[PDB]
Symmetry: C3
Subunit: 415 residues, 3 copies
């Protein structure tokens, strides 16, 4: 399979020479092999991208209850996110300060205190070490609380940053709020979660995500509701919006629902509320709303889909009736974890207000089709005969946009 091909390919690969490769890179072409296949570049992507930027973790509604927690792995980091006694959500390194053990072993739960399973060093929900057995009179517990992790709440969506010197989150947060607040995500519940591993590099997952050049042949279910128009998927709107699209933005905004396409100065994130195809209202097989009790106050009913990406961790679709978040996490040079979360109103009842299959089938199928595509792409790229090829200017503008953001971010980090 791909794991073998990965080993085979790295055996004869030329040196990574990253500065030389970055120097000769042209924006209109796919990346040279080792960006997608080498452990050297993968290590740089972890150190300089995933461990330095803000990352989407989970919806805040998963931490609704007192003492609730959820855990996730980011690269080699094990993080626990908890609702503290004061109602604040905080994140910590899930590593006991005694001898290093994980403290929370389950993916989610509720606790009164964080108690290490090894020797029961006990921490308060704010990270403070409040009991350590028989450590002697010269032990200073104030030096041994859990190590915090930088955390922000983006209007009901929890973001974290593993750096001691996180970049600016506030510009993004301020920009996004008008678009997100109308979805009332703090009042959501998780209706379903799907976690899959795709056997391709995280950048291949993103390049695939940032175009619909592949969609008509590969996504029969999605194409019923999501338009193939390159302006929707891509970033050609940044230079100017078509009349048809602006007319949609205006219908939304006349109705009080922010829609207008906005792209970060540095290209890290984009928000836009795009029309669905034809008469579709939601990502379903019949095109109608999946949930009869809407999540948020979006108007009009055919307001379409709020697209939001924030590199490197997340793309999202916020519809009038429900919302979907996607989290991208690196597993190895040729493996990527994608977590899709369906959010519905907290009072929407499964079997009454929505049907689980009807709610999820379209994107379950789509993700599976994307995974197959990404994996097939990865296998060809592993050939030593692979060379960069040209992106379509009309169909892949969004791919070039992502690859530029990635290369610039890496260049800056290596400076």
């Amino acid at each position: 399979g791909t794991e073998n091909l990965y080993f085979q390919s790295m055996m004869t690969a030329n040196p990574t020479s990253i500065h030389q490769r970055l120097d000769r890179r042209l924006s209109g072409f796919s990346l040279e092999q080792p960006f997608y296949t080498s452990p050297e570049v993968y290590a740089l992507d972890l150190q300089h991208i995933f461990y330095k930027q803000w990352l989407y973790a989970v919806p805040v509604c998963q931490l609704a209850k007192a003492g609730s927690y959820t855990t996730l792995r980011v690269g080699a980091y094990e993080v626990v996110i908890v609702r503290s006694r004061d109602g604040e959500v905080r994140a910590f390194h899930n590593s006991c300060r005694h001898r290093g053990s994980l403290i929370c072993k389950a993916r989610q739960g509720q606790v009164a205190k964080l108690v290490c399973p090894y020797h029961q060093w006990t921490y308060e929900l704010d990270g403070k070490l409040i009991w350590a057995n028989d450590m002697g009179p010269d032990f200073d517990a104030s030096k041994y609380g859990l190590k915090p992790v930088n955390l922000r709440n983006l209007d009901g969506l929890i973001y974290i940053c593993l750096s001691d010197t996180p970049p600016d989150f506030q510009t993004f947060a301020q920009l996004a709020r008008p678009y997100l607040e109308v979805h009332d995500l703090k009042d959501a519940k998780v209706a379903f979660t799907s976690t899959i591993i795709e056997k391709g590099n995280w950048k291949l997952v993103w390049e695939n995500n940032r175009e619909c050049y592949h969609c008509s042949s590969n996504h029969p279910a999605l194409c019923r509701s999501f338009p193939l128009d390159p302006e929707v998927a891509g970033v050609q709107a940044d230079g100017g919006v078509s009349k048809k699209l602006q007319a949609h933005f205006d219908r939304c905004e006349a109705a009080g629902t922010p829609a207008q396409f906005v792209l970060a100065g540095d290209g890290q994130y984009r928000l836009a509320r795009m029309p669905l195809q034809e008469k579709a209202l939601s990502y379903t097989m019949d095109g109608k709303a999946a949930v009869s009790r809407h999540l948020g106050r979006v108007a009009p009913p055919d307001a379409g889909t709020l697209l939001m990406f924030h590199y490197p961790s997340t793309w999202n679709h916020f519809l009038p009736d429900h919302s979907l978040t996607f989290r991208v996490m690196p597993i190895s040079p040729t493996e990527t974890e994608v977590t899709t979360t369906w959010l519905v109103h907290k009072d929407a009842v499964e079997g009454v207000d929505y049907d689980l299959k009807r709610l999820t089938e379209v994107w379950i199928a789509t993700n599976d089709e994307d995974r197959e595509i990404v994996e097939t792409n990865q296998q060809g790229i592993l050939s030593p005969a692979y060379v960069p090829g040209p992106y379509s200017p009309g169909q892949e503008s969004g791919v070039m946009q992502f690859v530029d953001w990635y290369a610039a971010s890496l260049e800056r980090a290596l400076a």
Copy 2:
């Protein structure tokens, strides 16, 4: 298992120092550990041996039909071999020139055109890019056809070479033709294929193949039909042929069937038509022909077995009634893929002219026994206590011959 032992062994291994190891190598001894166990030597074997020499791929009869194709992996290369519209068989890198994707995902099939599953760039069966959607007015498709792979047809057997500067194939092809043509391989069909992975280095598979020192204890089925006489398996005939053997060569050649032992000047290949044991006619449990409708025009009926090896990819047995090809492909430092293909006349009918079990049981068993032997050999070699030992001059002349060819080829490539 062996994968663990591989990791354990490389941890404490001395540096590879390949030039120093090559310098001190004596031809009468097995190779020092890292030749059989190290990823450093494995990488050199791929780069300098498998990616530079002509390799057996598949019988041409698998590409009998219009638009037929077959795919194979050689190291990290994914290759597709196709019968083009003009009747020519060509090979290409199975990597789309857009973003790199595999084009043909199945092991075999038929197509009208080669259509990439990702964004449907469409290629003619000669590799030319004939359609690429929405690539703009400055896109030159003539720069983006599939990359060709050097290919030859050795009398019904397809060989390929991954180098842009392939070595001479013509000397071998010219020498082999008289021996092969009488088997009419272009009129064969594949009756059966067996693919196994042996957990030993590709060179251990070859060293095992090039002797029958192990045969009497390890191959009860084979020994019924294949002689143990070292002159048969080995290369002592190169210095002079025994009277008994020459008498066999003469029976064949008086009957118009080329038999005489011939060995390449550089040792890369050897052809010889050798007698079977006793009264055996074929590789069966009862010694009689497996197929009643013969593949080719070999005479007399006890002409025996045409042995042909061509390093590094193939050994072969061509009998009067059917033929067997073996393809050796490297998987990792301690793994090798061996593909055995049974060829019979295209009009031979399974259940009438041959029985599948009767046709295949002997070599299925033999390959399994060889695999066990090679794997057991590999495990001992992984010990840091392993040191070269002496080959038997009488029983292992053919092993020394292979190891010399390998070492010389590596020396020349590193020069």
Copy 3:
């Protein structure tokens, strides 16, 4: 799982800089990450610790019969231990001197001679090559006997050393004999063996073993019979023995059973006969003897447990009724094999004198609980946020003792 976390963690890890890390190490703290996670340190641990020190292999009673043998893997070494024709137990490298093959493929068995399965080079049970087929007149078999492995018999327990220059074993052997001889281990049989792989570094297995700081929360079955008192598990007795403990040592020694705590000058090994909790006599759920026919002549019946450790390979519990040996063998940087062997009197009859479940359930459970603990510890340590933490002086004195022995041994080896 852990294998992924291992790969993730090594990607961004700082250089190992082992001399710098060793230089700054403080004895009161857990080790810096790469000691527990890096392949570089693992390679040094194999080369300088496991391949240089004496290691426990198996009880001699497994080699009771003529021509009996047993095999084990130590790192990448494959070793065979055999009872020779003269009654001596010897060990050899299980690698044929011809081409390297394993000779003995089974874990245990009996043979007349050691016959290589490949080409049947035949060795006497003392390693001498007595037959090699068709090797020519200039073959000197005296140069090609099996390579010996240094072996000692510690009062019924077989120890080996992979170095050509083994350290002193005699000081340990002489010290241990009075304690061990009363267990009559030469008259034992193996009642049961359990082999498990724990997904943590071998040093984490040892650090866990050398404290009961974790025991009250994690070992309900064990705590019924094994005391939590830090003086029992640890090495605080080295500076002076409590009155209660000395009273126990005196009961044993008045009765002729050596008990007194003794610790090696260099800390490599320790023997002590410790009291069990409450009225317990053995490691059972009811606290009574597991076997009605005792192994050895220990007195009094509540003499408790003879604890013996010898780094890096073994800890042991010798009770009045039966004994348990534990063998620690490295598998990878984050994997360790632990083999627990229950020894009972050779005439003790399963189903009459002991019940298999009753005999083994306590330590089967305990080992499983330890494995979970070690694996959870390993996962947290893999975080790049992991930093050394302080050991409990009162509860983890034995952990510091082991870590000191390890660091000193590595320092000396690198000198």
